[PDB]
Curated annotation (Swiss-Prot), chain A:
Residues 31-62 are lumenal. The gene is Cnih2. It comes from Rattus norvegicus (Rat). It is found in: Endoplasmic reticulum membrane; Postsynaptic cell membrane; Cell projection, Dendrite; Cell projection, Dendritic spine. This is Protein cornichon homolog 2. Its main location: endoplasmic reticulum.
From Swiss-Prot, chain B:
Ionotropic glutamate receptor that functions as a ligand-gated cation channel, gated by L-glutamate and glutamatergic agonists such as alpha-amino-3-hydroxy-5-methyl-4-isoxazolepropionic acid (AMPA), quisqualic acid, and kainic acid. L-glutamate acts as an excitatory neurotransmitter at many synapses in the central nervous system and plays an important role in fast excitatory synaptic transmission. The chain holds residues 507 to 557 of 883 of the full protein. The M4 transmembrane segment mediates tetramerization and is required for cell surface expression. The gene is Gria2. Induction: Down-regulated in the pyramidal cell layer of CA1 in the hippocampus by global ischemia. Palmitoylated. Depalmitoylated upon L-glutamate stimulation. It comes from Rattus norvegicus. This is Glutamate receptor 2.
Length: 62, 51
């Protein structure tokens, strides 16, 4: 029957979706980082270098 | 019965337990939680956390 442990399990079940969301966000951000890294890292254009650096910083902050 | 003769019992009985009558217990510290079971209180705490 309903008890303290069952309620704990329900609440953890609801809160584990958040962890799944967080890890999915992690892997998406790291896939973007890989797309930036494995792709040529030439920074000849100052604007391109600044944009890439700010993207990296933004993802790290996130 | 080996030396005298009895009648059929006029009163049957047996061993039993005597206790002091339960009294109005002196109220305990934290008797204000008694209306709800401890499990309800803990579920309340963790529902607060979860919300």
């Amino acid at each position: 029957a309903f008890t303290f442990a069952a309620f704990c399990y329900m609440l953890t079940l609801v809160l584990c979706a958040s962890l799944i969301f967080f890890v999915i966000w992690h892997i998406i951000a790291f896939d973007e980082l890989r797309t930036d890294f494995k792709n040529p890292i030439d920074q000849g254009n100052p604007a391109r270098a600044r944009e890439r650096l700010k993207n990296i910083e933004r993802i790290c902050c996130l | 019965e080996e030396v005298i003769d009895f009648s059929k019992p006029f009163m049957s009985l047996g061993i039993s337990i005597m206790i002091k009558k339960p009294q109005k217990s002196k109220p305990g510290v934290f008797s204000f939680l008694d209306p709800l079971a401890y499990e309800i209180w803990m579920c309340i705490v963790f529902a607060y956390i979860g919300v």
